[PDB]
Design an enzyme around this catalytic site. Structure first.
Site, PDB file in Angstrom:
ATOM      1  N   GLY A  71      48.485  36.483  53.566  1.00 14.42           N
ATOM      2  CA  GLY A  71      47.955  35.178  52.864  1.00 14.42           C
ATOM      3  C   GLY A  71      46.675  35.427  52.212  1.00 14.42           C
ATOM      4  N   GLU A 116      40.249  40.153  53.849  1.00 18.20           N
ATOM      5  CA  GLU A 116      38.753  40.249  54.044  1.00 18.20           C
ATOM      6  C   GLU A 116      38.056  41.338  53.396  1.00 18.20           C
ATOM      7  OE1 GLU A 116      40.101  40.753  58.143  1.00 18.20           O
ATOM      8  OE2 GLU A 116      38.309  41.820  58.623  1.00 18.20           O
ATOM      9  N   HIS A 155      38.833  30.875  55.459  1.00 16.27           N
ATOM     10  CA  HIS A 155      39.320  32.249  56.715  1.00 16.27           C
ATOM     11  C   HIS A 155      38.431  33.470  56.047  1.00 16.27           C
ATOM     12  CE1 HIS A 155      41.209  34.168  59.955  1.00 16.27           C
ATOM     13  NE2 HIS A 155      41.554  35.068  59.106  1.00 16.27           N
ATOM     14  N   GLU A 156      38.925  33.780  54.857  1.00 19.20           N
ATOM     15  CA  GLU A 156      38.378  35.137  54.087  1.00 19.20           C
ATOM     16  C   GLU A 156      36.805  34.964  53.996  1.00 19.20           C
ATOM     17  OE1 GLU A 156      40.598  37.500  54.705  1.00 19.20           O
ATOM     18  OE2 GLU A 156      42.121  35.771  54.993  1.00 19.20           O
ATOM     19  N   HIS A 164      34.976  35.895  56.899  1.00 15.44           N
ATOM     20  CA  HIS A 164      35.132  37.164  57.350  1.00 15.44           C
ATOM     21  C   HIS A 164      33.881  38.002  56.962  1.00 15.44           C
ATOM     22  CE1 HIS A 164      38.582  38.243  59.639  1.00 15.44           C
ATOM     23  NE2 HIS A 164      39.714  37.491  58.611  1.00 15.44           N
ATOM     24  N   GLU A 217      39.408  38.112  63.791  1.00 11.71           N
ATOM     25  CA  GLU A 217      40.208  36.993  63.481  1.00 11.71           C
ATOM     26  C   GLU A 217      39.917  35.825  64.183  1.00 11.71           C
ATOM     27  OE1 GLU A 217      41.894  37.631  60.465  1.00 11.71           O
ATOM     28  OE2 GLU A 217      41.159  39.607  60.860  1.00 11.71           O
ATOM     29  N   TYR A 262      44.907  35.652  66.640  1.00 10.89           N
ATOM     30  CA  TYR A 262      44.216  34.524  65.740  1.00 10.89           C
ATOM     31  C   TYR A 262      43.965  33.291  66.550  1.00 10.89           C
ATOM     32  CZ  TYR A 262      44.973  36.595  60.922  1.00 10.89           C
ATOM     33  OH  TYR A 262      44.905  37.278  59.930  1.00 10.89           O
TER      34      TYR A 262
HETATM   35  O1  LIG Z   1      44.251  38.885  57.038  1.00  9.54           O
HETATM   36  C1  LIG Z   1      44.597  40.203  57.531  1.00  9.54           C
HETATM   37  C2  LIG Z   1      45.914  39.999  58.223  1.00  9.54           C
HETATM   38  C3  LIG Z   1      46.394  41.272  59.134  1.00  9.54           C
HETATM   39  N1  LIG Z   1      45.936  42.515  58.131  1.00  9.54           N
HETATM   40  C4  LIG Z   1      46.902  43.688  58.530  1.00  9.54           C
HETATM   41  C5  LIG Z   1      46.667  44.061  60.070  1.00  9.54           C
HETATM   42  C6  LIG Z   1      47.723  44.020  60.973  1.00  9.54           C
HETATM   43  C7  LIG Z   1      47.466  44.605  62.293  1.00  9.54           C
HETATM   44  C8  LIG Z   1      46.207  44.669  62.520  1.00  9.54           C
HETATM   45  O2  LIG Z   1      45.820  45.292  63.699  1.00  9.54           O
HETATM   46  C9  LIG Z   1      46.061  44.485  65.113  1.00  9.54           C
HETATM   47  C10 LIG Z   1      46.650  43.325  65.237  1.00  9.54           C
HETATM   48  C11 LIG Z   1      46.816  42.654  66.324  1.00  9.54           C
HETATM   49  C12 LIG Z   1      46.717  43.174  67.508  1.00  9.54           C
HETATM   50  C13 LIG Z   1      46.429  42.659  68.895  1.00  9.54           C
HETATM   51  C14 LIG Z   1      45.806  42.928  69.775  1.00  9.54           C
HETATM   52  C15 LIG Z   1      46.131  41.945  70.776  1.00  9.54           C
HETATM   53  N2  LIG Z   1      47.116  41.350  70.720  1.00  9.54           N
HETATM   54  N3  LIG Z   1      47.410  41.889  69.375  1.00  9.54           N
HETATM   55  C16 LIG Z   1      45.789  44.451  67.399  1.00  9.54           C
HETATM   56  N4  LIG Z   1      45.584  45.192  66.284  1.00  9.54           N
HETATM   57  C17 LIG Z   1      45.352  44.666  61.639  1.00  9.54           C
HETATM   58  N5  LIG Z   1      45.339  44.424  60.563  1.00  9.54           N
HETATM   59  C18 LIG Z   1      45.768  42.298  56.900  1.00  9.54           C
HETATM   60  C19 LIG Z   1      44.915  41.202  56.496  1.00  9.54           C
HETATM   61 ZN   LIG Z   2      41.725  37.366  58.510  1.00  6.75          ZN
END
Ligand SMILES: OC1CCN(Cc2ccc(Oc3ccc(-c4ccn[nH]4)cn3)cn2)CC1
Ligand SMILES: [Zn+2]
Ligand SMILES: [Yb+3]
Ligand SMILES: [Yb+3]
Ligand SMILES: [Yb+3]
Length: 607
Positions: free
Chosen positions: A265, A268, A292-293, A296, A315, A380
């Protein structure tokens, strides 16, 4: 201390600057260039430093103006390959040396997506874009791929004279290439320290229009008009966000509308954010993704996570400010409605992934686990669920926002863990420690499933959505004739989406119920990417054969994983589409994004 990295930690070595001099050859589908890393040593007598690579080929490593001996280790799945570089002469503490690496990317790199003119909304020019978050900057250039290191960067990119090149930095110049007349070199300067995962490049037939004193909206000629309207509230949002975090010290804030292909969506990226074209509904309802962005630029761009286990700090805190901008623009009745919607999305992610599942905790163990796979609604909404609970214990909105203003101030330009946040949460509220001690810490941070406490939300806006949702679920065969277009004569676009979301939690419903909905409300006619998504899911789960062409089309229409992944998984469960779901994946695999294709494939059980 970072599991997701193969490089030397910040304790041993720290990168301070990066000078990228590259060229974008669309014929070869590579990023031909040299990266100059002004690396600093944090240990006495440092003989070798290790860097992160993935799908890369190195020609030479130039230190002090001479070729040095470099060694690349064995490949380890999603992590990539470690690149040990033997230094000519040992380093002292705080001794800064430049390392010019002559890299070469892969056309099948996990970060960059190469677009054929047909894939673009211009049909006459190619397009290129990146996505370095989380561990994908190693797939573009060799660096210390860890958010524990914040670095500055200056760049020069050679692209054809008929294209526009843009980076996550402020532009400096525009001049043609010396040993290529058909090319143009664009300069980019990022004075503000930023980790590698926030570095991004975008090349194509782009055009800009001003929407305020500091905003520029970038997209193709026949996409600019509705991009100007949909995000016209950005300037006002930024002025509100500044009174929540602090001053905006990035010079210019820009919005870049990507082609459908983009899997998120919003991203950042500093100075130039990355948005999906699905946000364009024509009504300005999907404006919260912009909120949201914007938020950030404080959480994530100033207060960054040291490792990826502490991602919730990015997030989770951003979702708080996102709802506060909307809660200063549309009222507290809306802020509470969105917060209630958040728990709803969280329930959907906890029930899908599993209650005792490890990727439902707020601080998970990313040892031997890819972060792109573990990405869900937990960092999130569960991260926000904690903050909203704390807010309704320590005081209220004005009191808790006062903590965040001091929090951004305390850890600005820094990389922090959950341990660092809890100390400041106890230092700021040094008199309300009694209230803080009532909070079960292992249950919210390290325990799987739903949080132990569900906070109090204002149901004023949400109740109408629940009333119409419960009306359908309880309705029988004879009851279906009571439903008219009159039902949604007062329900807003957000309230219509909330009604669909509430119904989908209780889906599947009888086939006659679904058929009737379209006969009175005409849900197929709507062009709202959020409303259309849930409605399509509702039909496929309920076994509607008329929805199969529309459901497949929406997954090919765009690249956002928030909508494509559910659809391709829904049609895979549904008997009369299982073949088409697989057939469409393998026939569109080439055109797909290296992240989108990777995750969809596993969910469909396809190699
Ligand atoms: O707008 C943003 C939307 C997401 N990214 C990509 C992305 C994907 C995974 C990520 O790393 C993560 C994700 C969740 C958890 C987690 C911790 C506890 N539970 N889950 C830990 N690391 C970081 N970025 C693109 C732009
Ligand atoms: Zn984000
Ligand atoms: Yb300049
Ligand atoms: Yb402490
Ligand atoms: Yb009845």
């Amino acid at each position: 201390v970072d599991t997701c990295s193969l490089a030397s930690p910040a304790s041993v070595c720290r990168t301070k600057h990066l000078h990228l001099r590259c060229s974008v050859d669309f014929t070869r589908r590579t990023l031909t260039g040299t990266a100059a890393l002004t690396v600093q040593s944090q240990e006495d007598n440092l003989r070798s430093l290790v860097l992160d690579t993935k799908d890369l080929t190195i020609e030479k490593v130039v230190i002090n103006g001479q070729e040095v001996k470099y060694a690349l280790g064995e490949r380890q799945s999603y992590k990539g390959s470690p690149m040990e570089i033997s230094l000519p002469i040992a380093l002292s503490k705080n001794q800064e040396i430049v390392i010019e690496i002559s890299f070469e990317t892969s056309p099948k790199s996990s970060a960059l997506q190469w677009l054929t003119p047909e894939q673009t909304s211009g049909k006459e020019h190619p397009y290129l874009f990146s996505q370095c978050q989380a561990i994908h900057c190693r797939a573009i250039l060799p660096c210390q791929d860890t958010p524990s290191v914040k670095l500055t960067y200056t760049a020069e990119v050679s692209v054809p004279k008929e294209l526009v090149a843009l980076m996550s930095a402020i532009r400096d110049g525009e001049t043609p290439d010396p040993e290529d007349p058909s090319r143009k070199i664009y300069k980019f300067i990022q004075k503000v320290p930023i980790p590698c995962y926030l570095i991004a490049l975008v090349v194509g037939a782009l055009e800009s229009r001003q929407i305020g004193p500091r905003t520029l909206v970038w997209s193709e000629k026949e996409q600019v008009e509705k991009s100007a309207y949909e995000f016209s509230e950005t300037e006002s949002m930024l002025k509100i966000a500044e009174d929540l975090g602090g001053p905006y010290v990035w010079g210019q804030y820009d919005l870049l509308v990507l082609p459908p292909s983009f899997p998120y969506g919003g991203m950042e990226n500093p100075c130039l954010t990355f948005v999906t074209p699905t946000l364009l509904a024509g009504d300005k309802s999907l404006s919260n993704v912009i909120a949201h962005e914007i938020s950030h630029s404080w959480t994530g761009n100033l207060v960054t996570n040291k490792t990826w286990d502490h991602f919730w700090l990015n997030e989770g805190h951003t979702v708080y400010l996102e709802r506060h901008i909307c809660g200063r623009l549309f009222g507290e009745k809306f802020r509470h409605f969105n917060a209630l919607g958040g728990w709803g999305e969280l329930q959907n992610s906890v029930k899908t992934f599993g209650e005792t599942h490890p990727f439902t905790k707020l601080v998970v163990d990313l040892t031997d686990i890819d972060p792109d796979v573990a990405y869900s609604s937990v960092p999130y909404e569960k991260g926000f669920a904690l903050l909203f609970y704390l807010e309704q214990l320590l005081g209220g909105p004005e009191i808790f926002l006062g903590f965040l203003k001091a929090y951004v101030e305390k850890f600005s330009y820094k990389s922090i863990t959950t341990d660092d946040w809890k100390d400041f949460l106890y230092s700021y509220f040094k008199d309300k420690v009694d209230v803080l001690n009532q909070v079960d810490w292992n249950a919210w941070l390290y325990s799987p499933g739903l949080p132990p406490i569900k906070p109090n939300y204002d149901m004023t806006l949400t109740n109408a959505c629940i009333a119409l949702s419960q009306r359908w679920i309880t309705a029988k065969e004879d009851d279906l004739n009571s439903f008219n277009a009159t039902d949604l004569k007062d329900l807003s676009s957000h309230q219509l989406n909330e009604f669909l979301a509430q119904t989908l939690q209780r889906a599947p419903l009888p086939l006659g119920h679904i058929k009737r909905m379209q006969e009175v409300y005409n849900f197929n006619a709507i062009n709202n990417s959020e409303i259309r998504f849930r409605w399509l899911r509702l039909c496929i789960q309920s076994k509607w054969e008329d929805a199969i062409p529309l459901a497949l089309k929406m997954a090919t229409e765009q690249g956002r994983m928030k909508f494509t992944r559910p659809l391709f998984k829904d049609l895979a469960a549904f008997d009369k589409s299982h073949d088409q779901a697989v057939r469409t994946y393998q026939e569109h695999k080439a055109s797909m994004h290296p992240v989108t294709a990777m995750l969809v494939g596993k969910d469909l059980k396809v190699d």
